[PDB]
Design goal:
The complex is a heterodimer of chains A (76) and B (194). By secondary structure, chain A is α+β, with helices and mostly antiparallel strands. Helices cover 26% and strands 26% of the residues of chain A. Chain A starts with 5 loop residues before the first helix and ends in a 5-residue tail after the last helix. Classes of the chains: A alpha+beta (76), B alpha+beta (194). Chain A: It comes from Pseudomonas aeruginosa.
Amino acid sequence: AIEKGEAFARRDIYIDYDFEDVTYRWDHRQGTIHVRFYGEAESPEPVEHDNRLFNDALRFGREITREEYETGFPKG
Amino acid sequence: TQVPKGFEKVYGKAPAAKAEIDAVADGLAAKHGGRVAKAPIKSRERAMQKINNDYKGDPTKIKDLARNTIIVEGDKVNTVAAELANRGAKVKVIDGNADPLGYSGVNSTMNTKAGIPGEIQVNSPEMIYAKESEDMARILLGNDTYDAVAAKAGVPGGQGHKYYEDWRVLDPKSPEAQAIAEKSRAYYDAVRKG
């Protein structure tokens, strides 16, 4: 899990949620969420902060590094 | 509202995926003394909205077009989880110590012969009582299980989904998140103590 609050205001946060083969990038300066599905480039459209799958990723996913996120995960 | 590319091709396998996951669900449910709450195929507009919002317009990524719930007693939940795993399901086992909201239960995704995923959830009557509104819990558990669980429950039912709704709409840096999550964990913990 990646709880809402302190960390998101502290720095960029990168998230892996293997149950749905999805990753997220949080930019704390811009306040934006982007999504990157396994085997794909990052989607250009930002994600809404009340988005269902994003909040699932917070509850059940795990934090990863910027390099892991940018390298990406093979399509499942 | 934009129809996703390939949407109807995926949507048409949903009845066959439903039959498939419903067959395995009632097998496993009737094996361990439980029940299966079957549900209809996800409605068209909501399916499309979910594909566009969660999955950025790819309809092959949506996993709950067909779905059901297996309700079994608490100590059988794990047994059923292992059962779905042995059939190749992708399985998420949630314990209350990791989820910020303290929920517990099983979720699984099954790739059915029809070529789309089916969702099968598993939980105990106590957990469902705790999480869902009364109307919802009565459908999932049946009227008699609902009434049995409510009489022996040590906490008012139906608060869990409330905390989730308040927590979900918060911005990721909200000052309010931590207090709501704590209230949710304390609630589900009281349910599980008894």
